[PDB]
From a paper:
Some bacteriophage encode a recombinase that catalyzes single-stranded DNA annealing (SSA). Redβ belongs to a large group of proteins annotated as the [name] family based on the protein from the rac prophage of E. coli. Here, we have used single-particle cryo-EM to determine a 3.4 Å structure of a homolog of λ-Redβ from the [name] prophage of [name] that we will refer to as LiRecT. The structure confirms that the [name]/Redβ family of annealing proteins share a common core fold with RAD52.
To determine if there is a similar structural transition for LiRecT, we prepared a complex of it with just one 83-mer [name] and obtained a ~5 Å resolution cryo-EM reconstruction by single particle analysis. Surprisingly, the LiRecT-[name] complex also exists as left-handed helical filaments, instead of as rings, but they are not as well ordered, and they do not stack end-to-end. Using a monomer of LiRecT from the complex with annealed duplex, 8 subunits of LiRecT could be docked into the reconstruction for the central portion of the filament. Due to the lower resolution of this reconstruction, we could not fit the [name] to the map, although there is strong density for DNA in the groove above α2 and α3. Strikingly, the density for the portion of each LiRecT subunit at the upper rim of the filament is almost completely absent in the structure with [name], for the entire length of the filament. This upper N-terminal lobe of each monomer (N-lobe), which is formed by the αA–αC bundle and the β1–β2 hairpin, would likely clamp down on the DNA once the second strand is incorporated, to form the additional protein-DNA and inter-subunit interactions that are shown in Fig. 4 for the complex with annealed duplex. Moreover, cryo-EM images collected for LiRecT protein without DNA reveal smaller particles that are much less well ordered, suggesting that the filament is assembled on the [name] (a full data set without DNA was not collected).
Author numbering:
A (entry chain J), B (entry chain I), C (entry chain H), D (entry chain G), E (entry chain F), F (entry chain E), ...: 110 to 221
The structure:
Amino acid sequence: YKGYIQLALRTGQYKSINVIEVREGELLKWNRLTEEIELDLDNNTSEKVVGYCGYFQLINGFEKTVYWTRKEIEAHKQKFSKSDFGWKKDYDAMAKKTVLRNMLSKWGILSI
Amino acid sequence: YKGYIQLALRTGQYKSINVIEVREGELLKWNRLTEEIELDLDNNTSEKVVGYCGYFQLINGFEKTVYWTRKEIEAHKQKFSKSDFGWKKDYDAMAKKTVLRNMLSKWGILSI
Amino acid sequence: YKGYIQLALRTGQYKSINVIEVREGELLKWNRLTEEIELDLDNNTSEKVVGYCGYFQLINGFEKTVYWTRKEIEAHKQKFSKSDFGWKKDYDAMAKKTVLRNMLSKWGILSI
Amino acid sequence: YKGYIQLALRTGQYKSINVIEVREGELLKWNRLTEEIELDLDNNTSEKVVGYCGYFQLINGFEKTVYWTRKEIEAHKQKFSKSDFGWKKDYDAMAKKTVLRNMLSKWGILSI
Amino acid sequence: YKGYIQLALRTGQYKSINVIEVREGELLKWNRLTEEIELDLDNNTSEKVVGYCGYFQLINGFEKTVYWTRKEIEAHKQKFSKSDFGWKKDYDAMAKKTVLRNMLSKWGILSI
Amino acid sequence: YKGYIQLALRTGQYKSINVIEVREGELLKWNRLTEEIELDLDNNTSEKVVGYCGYFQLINGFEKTVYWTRKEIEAHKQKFSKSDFGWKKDYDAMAKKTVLRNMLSKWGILSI
Amino acid sequence: YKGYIQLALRTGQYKSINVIEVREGELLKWNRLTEEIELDLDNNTSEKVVGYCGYFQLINGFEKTVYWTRKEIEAHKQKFSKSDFGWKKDYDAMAKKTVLRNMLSKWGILSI
Amino acid sequence: YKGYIQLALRTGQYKSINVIEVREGELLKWNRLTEEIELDLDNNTSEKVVGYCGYFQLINGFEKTVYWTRKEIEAHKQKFSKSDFGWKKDYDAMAKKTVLRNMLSKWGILSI
């Protein structure tokens, strides 16, 4: 993936990129059609995360939002992944790296 | 198709683009004349997709919606497609790429 | 025609445009004076198209409907068209492109 | 005339406009006082047109009907028109353009 | 007068308006008290007009009829009009415009 | 008075209204009790008017007739009117407007 | 009283109503039993009114006549009326309005 | 009683109805068998009424006369009436209303 981030930095036409995790009872409602999402901070009771989100905006004003839950990531690990040694040590880091690599791959522009 | 996406990004006058899949018992009703579509989320029982949809809106306020079902895609694969090795591995990805290439081709503006 | 679509997009005062085909036993009744048309979906028995229709609405609320049958298109191809190589490969695409070019030409506004 | 259509489109308070030709044995009866007209379709025997008609309705519900025959148009061409090169090539297009320009002129509202 | 027509259109509570000319041997009998008028079409021999008429009906069902002859118009031109350059070019158009302006003025409702 | 006519039009329950002038040797006999009046047209010799009349009929069949002569109008101008600049320019128009305002006032129904 | 006239108009079953004043030396003889009254016009010498009369006839043929003199009206003003500011300005209008209100009240039919 | 008058008006087959009071030294002679009554007007000296009378005639020519004196009305008030507050304010109005109600009741035809 580090090659993908290297190419993204060498491209030099992006403005901002961010990936975060949304924990139980944090957001209000998400739309899968118009990409409408709203979130309220410091109002929560649990300590277990429920999903992941990512926001990427370019210098020309174009923006993109992606949101995933546990069902898709478990389906992906059970049909594509073939390693399990790192899954016991941590649960989120490899999920984040997969999210980044896919979002950079199928939408992101690459330059050499 | 990646050339088409490259040209679309280099054009730099679009605002948002999205392509999704609509699964059984998700939308309410679709109009083929006025492009009127409404969808209700998290209310569904099955696990088999039934159609595909796409929404593309420009920076000037112009928007366009496209919706396809299985009949048109199977007709297209039986009259135009000549390869079948990838159809057994996955069923949706190539359908999505065909949808994108056609929608970019016959409506989308291109620049060099 | 692609120049006409390019000029239409560069104009930037339209709201929605659509062109479709009406197949046998689909619509109910059409008025050629008040442009009154009503259509009932998923109630049909045949597989042969009978006409073409187009709806174009602007951002100011103005709308326009056009509907053509096979008689006018065959008269047009027999008095104006001088090529026949593409007519055997497909039957509808060039009819649609002629409909678009005429409707953009004699009503549509153009800007440079 | 194209300037008149441009001003009409830039006005942005109209709803629908249409101009057609009525051919022999098509309509039933026309009233010149109350603007009462009724027409029956697909019941005709000849192939020679006999008159022209136009219907224009605004967004506020106001509507207007105009109907002309060959006598008025021949009187107009013999007292006002000074050119004849285009009359041999076609017979109806310039009659339609005169109908549009007059109806837009003496009733239609114009804005700058 | 065009200002009067502009105000009438901007009012937006009228239904139909018409002004015509009645030529010799066209109508049957007219009543100046109950506004009873009846006319028979395509039964006439002369080619010289004898009077003018106007019918104006609102959206609420109210209707009004006005009919004038040559005596009143010649009295009006000889006591009020002060120009004669346009009278030789045409005879009816200015009579019609005076009829419209008076009927809009003394009965018609105006809004700003 | 124009406000009175505006209110009358906005009321929307009237059927017909008319005000005319009766000139010397025109009517036959008038009744002030049963409102019986009969008039014969195109049989007259003089050119000086002698009285004014008005007929107003509603949509429910109710009708009303009013007839005035010069004595009442001269008494009214000498006891109520305080202006004389317009009396020399014309003699009938202000008499008609007074007739309309009084008849609308003391019988006519008003709505807001 | 205007409410009484409003209710009378909204009733919509009357045919004609009239109230007049009879001046000295105008009528011939009046009967208080059979309501027989006869009057001769344009034969009079004085200029002082002596009484008031009213005729009201329905659509079904029923008619009613009422006639009053100065004695009854002065008795009524001295036993019922409590205001005198308007009596000096005019003498007849309030007498007429009292006649109308009483005749509408004790005979007239009212509807809501 | 107003209900009785309402029903009488809704019946719509009457022609004339009248009720009056006969004062001392007014009539000549009355017959209780053949209903023969004759009265001479404007020949009287007193100012105290002595009786009441009523005449009612239909559209078919049928007529009826009723005449009452003070003896019958005082007998009726002393055997039937149970209220006395209104008798001091006026003496005749309630007598008239009783006459009307009885005459409408025992002879008059009623319809619903």
